[PDB]
Symmetry: D2
């Protein structure tokens, strides 16, 4: 059920569009379109989920990555989201993320932002 | 190009993990991860993304990947994402931070996500 | 000034914690924290710092604080830091992210640190 | 042992100067002088540590905060370090940190940097 549950189009508090397909044994593939930052149009994403989650009430662990390069822009950075899908009537994907920019070693202390996103399904 | 040649290969870290990765197809990472520690045995699939046209000013090459800790023999109901950068030169490294989320009930979500850092060196 | 008046008070969060803090002396935070979850009972000492001359452009007021989880009742061999910002207005909040580090052996340091987020609202 | 262990002058891989005093029941007080960022001269720090750590080889949990305002500069930000002191012939304080800048709510996604610092004692 997690495969059909995860598969679809999602948004979050920032108003992004996250389109993903969950494959039968753990793949995530899709596109991300960002409301903020140095971004336009869609970016490829790929990731993995637990395709046989626990049946005790726990969420389904998952993660995915976007590198912020597409055919028209390159922000020299990549974001990974790590979180869990919680199904039901008001399904959500609750995540934390790490956004690393390419930097010189001297500037590596300011390479990585951290935050959180909650996604809700729109389709 | 040099980002693909630099990232592709077999990498280890201080914990003695084995990270086998190919970078190609204009931004895809694919490969397997074997964890020396934790609730893990043998290889797990990884997928991720990298910047396939990084800056040439001395900055590293941003990248990220995910492992869901389920394979054919074991399932730890969790996923790790690494977000970081590849830095070439005489001691080439992939410098990362990571988020490890376990599937939890809502009551236990506050304790769902570990954070840390890994530096990989090429074998 | 308004940062002191805004931050000083009693606050709670989504878990039902009680955070009692005074902001004064040009940047000090002092008070007590009572945790609704985890290996914790009764009040713990907190100390921290805040920006006592924040910008006036609409941005929040940066702050952070620490609790070591030892008091006269219990010791959980761990400490949490919250780093975030106070945002005034109708619906004033302190928006934070946190790192909870437990004492571990070196070998187990990869499991030492949980990460998450808390939003505090004034009671 | 943790009090004498922690108290002193420390540096890290960036070349900072961290001067701290650990009090018998858990206080940390001192100053921080930064090699990087929008910073000059000393800043106040305060934090907390576990004053009765485990004796099984585990580290001593601690954390502290700096708000980046002193008599001559204000970077409208605060960093919290969360980590553990490990004693012996190679004593270190191993940390992760969160650096939050005051932002508008629209820019909160880019308010918080994450990283790690390892301190070693100079005196
Ligand atoms: N849903 C989310 N949107 C934002 C966060 C994490 S991913 C981010 C959007 C990123 C778009 C691409 C981008 O602007 N990358 C460059 C970031 C440079 C940040 C420099 C900094 O201010 O420290 N969460
Ligand atoms: N190279 C690394 N090895 C470890 C860190 C992040 S990935 C991790 C190995 C994870 C193996 C799978 C596994 O044990 N997952 C379940 C973790 C449950 C942790 C619960 C807790 O201690 O909060 N970095
Ligand atoms: N408001 C919050 N409450 C919880 C989070 C971070 S602080 C935490 C409460 C911590 C209470 C003290 C405590 O239980 N310390 C030991 C933590 C052991 C977690 C071990 C693990 O599951 O990896 N946010
Ligand atoms: N030892 C360390 N030094 C750096 C890291 C975390 S604390 C940091 C030094 C911070 C100095 C004050 C300062 O520049 N604050 C403003 C930071 C704005 C970052 C904006 C961005 O690039 O996203 N660790």
């Amino acid at each position: 059920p997690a495969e059909a549950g995860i598969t679809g189009t999602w948004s979050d508090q920032l108003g992004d569009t996250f389109i993903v397909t969950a494959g039968a044994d753990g793949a995530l593939t899709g596109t991300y379109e960002s409301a903020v930052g140095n971004a336009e149009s869609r970016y490829v994403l790929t990731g993995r989920y637990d395709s046989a989650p626990a049946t005790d009430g726990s969420g389904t662990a998952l993660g995915w990555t976007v590198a912020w390069k597409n055919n028209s822009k390159n922000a020299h950075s990549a974001t990974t989201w790590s979180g869990q899908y919680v199904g039901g009537a008001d399904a959500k994907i609750n995540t934390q993320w790490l956004l690393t920019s390419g930097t010189t070693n001297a500037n590596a202390w300011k390479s990585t932002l951290v935050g959180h996103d909650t996604f809700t399904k729109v389709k």
